[PDB]
Design an enzyme around this catalytic site. Structure first.
Site, short mmCIF file in Angstrom:
data_model
loop_
_atom_site.label_atom_id
_atom_site.label_comp_id
_atom_site.label_asym_id
_atom_site.label_seq_id
_atom_site.Cartn_x
_atom_site.Cartn_y
_atom_site.Cartn_z
CD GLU A 198 -2.66 -1.29 -0.04
OE1 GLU A 198 -2.64 -2.37 -0.66
OE2 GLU A 198 -3.30 -0.29 -0.42
CD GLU A 240 -3.54 -2.97 -6.98
OE1 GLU A 240 -4.39 -2.48 -6.20
OE2 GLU A 240 -2.40 -3.31 -6.61
NE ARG A 291 0.71 -10.89 -3.57
CZ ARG A 291 -0.33 -10.29 -4.15
NH1 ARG A 291 -1.24 -11.00 -4.81
NH2 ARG A 291 -0.45 -8.97 -4.06
ZN LIG Z 1 -2.45 -2.72 -4.49
#
Ligand SMILES: [Zn+2]
Length: 424
Positions: A230, A267, A369
């Protein structure tokens, strides 16, 4: 270096590190909360994030017979002075973990110095306005005896607790007429709704091939990595380069992608790794040109700015230089600013690729991940991160002292059952 302040939730408001703040979306409403300055320009407000929601959303509340639906509630979270002090102490610990490496410290360093431009698109080019939600928040100078008095102050990020869905951490920018300063090169106060105990779970890893399934296993995430993720969003926002609405549809399911549903460009860069390779250079180059054009507007503004009506106490020249440093603009013999393609590219690159989830996990020995393209699985509730017998600033979960420093055994659900729970 970056200083991480310390404080107990019951300390007295000192009009400096501990104050009563009117959050951005409550501007001019008279609503204040207790805000703790964990570092210069960064604040923590242990309270639910209720903007845009109703006191009914916060608790669909089930109980008898209920197992998932991917979203999770708890109308009780943050409902006591103590829980607030816990949250507060937890965040401080996370920040300290973040700061345990030069890479994380530099991220924070960049966030603190990324001061928002004094104004937005609505501000005349020859002006510096500080009287807007994205530039300042009011502090409550007046005593507890009614009669409100307030002082507007500069801030960079405000981290609140979670909204209705606990496992839904998000970074938020301010829009007016749907135009975002945090997306137009100005930058603006960023906010976040974060929940450190409920962490995500993943199994899209061990991207190694050549033998059946490219390895499975089940791991949970490191709250500090989640937070830094974030924080990368925050950085883009303060520099005003947060990619605007732009969904990316993958044209092929590559070895690291578990899922295939379109993801926001913002993202893909934040995640880093191999994700932005999924972006067509066509699109990839346009985002770049995009930033450039925006800074072209900031530089022009700084060459024309001549005054600050909202505040007669601001030395236009002073700040006129701070932003020169912020955006890496060069000065000529006329005293005029301009953009140096050489230096501009170093900045863009650092802002867009210097800090990513992949290389941070990689630098912090944290297991994450293989791509942002991964299925969502039930999150888990970390019992107590304030227990060095489970979580430490140096190694997090993979604690060498507990024989969990190898193969991220510290993060393996099958291995470290003791540190988490299954929520419900
Ligand atoms: Zn994000």
């Amino acid at each position: 270096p970056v200083t991480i302040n310390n404080f107990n939730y019951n300390d007295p408001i000192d009009n400096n590190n501990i104050i009563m703040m009117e959050p951005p979306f409550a501007r001019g409403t008279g609503r204040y909360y207790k805000a703790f300055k964990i570092t210069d320009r960064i604040w923590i407000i242990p309270e639910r994030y209720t903007f845009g929601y109703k006191p009914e959303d916060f608790n669909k509340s089930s109980g008898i017979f209920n197992r998932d639906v991917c979203e999770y509630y708890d109308p009780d979270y943050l409902n006591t002075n103590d829980k607030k002090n816990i949250f507060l102490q937890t965040m401080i610990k996370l920040f300290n973990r973040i700061k345990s490496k030069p890479l994380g410290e530099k991220l924070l360093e960049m966030i603190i110095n990324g001061i928002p431009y004094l104004g937005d698109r609505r501000v005349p080019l020859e002006e510096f306005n500080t009287n807007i939600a994205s530039v300042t928040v009011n502090k409550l100078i007046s005593n507890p005896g009614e009669v409100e008095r307030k002082k507007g102050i500069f801030a960079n990020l405000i981290i609140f607790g979670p909204g209705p869905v606990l496992n839904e951490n998000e970074t938020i920018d301010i829009g007016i007429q749907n135009h975002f300063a945090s997306r137009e090169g100005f930058g603006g106060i960023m906010q976040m709704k974060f929940c450190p105990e409920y962490v995500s779970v993943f199994n899209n890893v061990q991207e190694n091939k050549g033998a059946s399934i490219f390895n499975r296993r089940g791991y949970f995430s490191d709250p500090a990595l989640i937070l830094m993720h974030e924080l990368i969003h925050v950085l883009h926002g303060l520099y005003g380069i947060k990619v605007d609405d732009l969904p990316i549809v993958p044209n092929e399911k590559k070895f690291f992608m578990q899922s295939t549903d379109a993801i926001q460009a913002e993202e893909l860069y934040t995640f880093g790794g191999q994700d932005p390779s999924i972006i067509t250079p066509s699109t990839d180059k346009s985002i770049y040109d995009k930033v450039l054009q925006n800074f072209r507007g900031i530089v022009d503004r700084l060459n024309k700015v001549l005054v600050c009506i909202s505040d007669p106490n601001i030395n236009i020249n002073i700040y006129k230089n701070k932003f020169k440093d912020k955006y890496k603009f060069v000065e000529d013999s006329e005293g005029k600013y301009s953009i140096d393609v050489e230096s501009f590219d170093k900045l863009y690159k650092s802002l867009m690729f210097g800090f990513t989830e992949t290389n941070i996990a990689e630098n912090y020995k944290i297991k994450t991940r293989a791509s942002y393209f991964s299925d969502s699985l039930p999150p888990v509730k970390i019992k107590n991160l304030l227990d060095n017998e489970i979580y430490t600033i140096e190694e997090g979960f993979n604690i060498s002292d507990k024989d969990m420093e190898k193969e991220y055994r510290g993060q393996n659900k099958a291995i470290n059952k003791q540190a988490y729970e299954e929520i419900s």
